[PDB]
């Protein structure tokens, strides 16, 4: 009964942009479609960075700026071509890492 299915994945630094993008990318899945799996959470990987405060010495004082990387997955049992043609247009967001695979 198992069969290959399209499984779009999203990635972004900001999360509000990411789950707004998730809602926008599943909303097209809902119309002219069926089932529509929700956006399941992924572990997310941050990158820490310690940098010196002073231009010269005083290495004892520093600061940690870091960049987290969120990830998400979305699925749909029915390929439904009409919402795939609808999928081609995406006004938002400029900052998103959608990836399509079947």
């Amino acid at each position: 009964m198992a069969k290959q299915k399209i499984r779009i994945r999203l990635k972004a630094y900001d999360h509000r942009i990411l789950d707004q993008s998730a809602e926008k990318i599943v909303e097209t899945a809902k119309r002219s479609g069926a089932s529509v799996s929700g956006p399941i959470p992924l572990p997310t990987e941050k990158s820490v960075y310690t940098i010196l405060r002073a231009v010269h010495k005083y290495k004892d004082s520093r600061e940690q700026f870091e960049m987290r990387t969120h990830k998400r997955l979305i699925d749909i049992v029915n390929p439904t071509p009409q919402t795939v043609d609808a999928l081609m247009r995406l006004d938002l967001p400029s900052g998103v890492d959608i990836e399509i695979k079947l």
Binding site: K11, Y13, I17, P93, S94, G95, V96, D97
Partner: protein
């Protein structure tokens, strides 16, 4: 410190980054092109002026929207100027471009503009004290819960060095919802450069839910 920049704290919790995008195979190259766009907008800062440019990119696309106190300076007559700028940027970025424009209401309220203006006043060799007073009066005309301002380096050419600051109303940088605008500027008198700083407390932001 002794004074950490509020702009380095406000971002994230209460304000958006000046340039948002995603990366990507080349995180550096997007940053290079964007910093170059800053380098040319800085050339546009010479007279047309700008408070800030917001930037967005999505693979072979860019959204370098501008907001400025004087919108017609960059548009020109017939809109030819924004087009020529669009070509000058298209020649460099190597990708499609469509620069946007915005006209801020009560533009004096913005920290970048008042800081650039008082800096130009320092270029005009007007007394720095009276200039800061006119700053506080003008921002008072702008209407705000609290405002602070500061200048450093040579002042009137007197003494080896001096630093001054004036303020009125609450200016709570330690507040995490303060939404305080921050600005810096660099005057260039023959006696020497003049450091410029200004803090603008727009007021607390109340979180929403639906």
């Amino acid at each position: 410190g002794q004074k950490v920049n509020p702009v380095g704290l406000r971002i994230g919790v209460i304000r958006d980054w000046e340039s948002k995008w995603y990366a990507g195979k080349d995180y550096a190259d997007f940053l290079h092109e964007d910093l170059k766009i800053r380098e040319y907008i800085s050339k546009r800062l010479s007279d047309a002026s700008v408070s800030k440019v917001e930037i967005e990119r999505a693979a072979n696309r860019v959204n370098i929207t501008i907001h400025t106190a004087k919108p017609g300076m960059v548009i020109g007559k017939g809109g030819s100027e924004v087009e020529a700028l669009r070509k000058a940027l298209n020649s460099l970025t190597g990708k499609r471009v469509h620069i946007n424009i915005l006209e801020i209401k009560r533009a004096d309220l913005d920290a970048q503009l008042v800081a650039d203006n008082i800096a130009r006043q320092l270029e005009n060799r007007v007394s720095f004290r009276r200039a800061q007073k006119q700053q506080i009066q003008r921002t008072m005309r702008a209407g705000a819960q609290g405002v602070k301002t500061m200048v450093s380096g040579r002042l009137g050419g007197a003494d080896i060095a001096r630093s001054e600051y004036y303020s009125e109303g609450t200016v709570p940088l330690h507040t995490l919802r303060a939404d305080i605008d921050y600005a810096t500027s660099e005057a260039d008198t023959t006696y020497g450069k003049l450091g410029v700083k200004v803090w603008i407390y727009r007021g607390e932001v109340l979180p929403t839910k639906k």
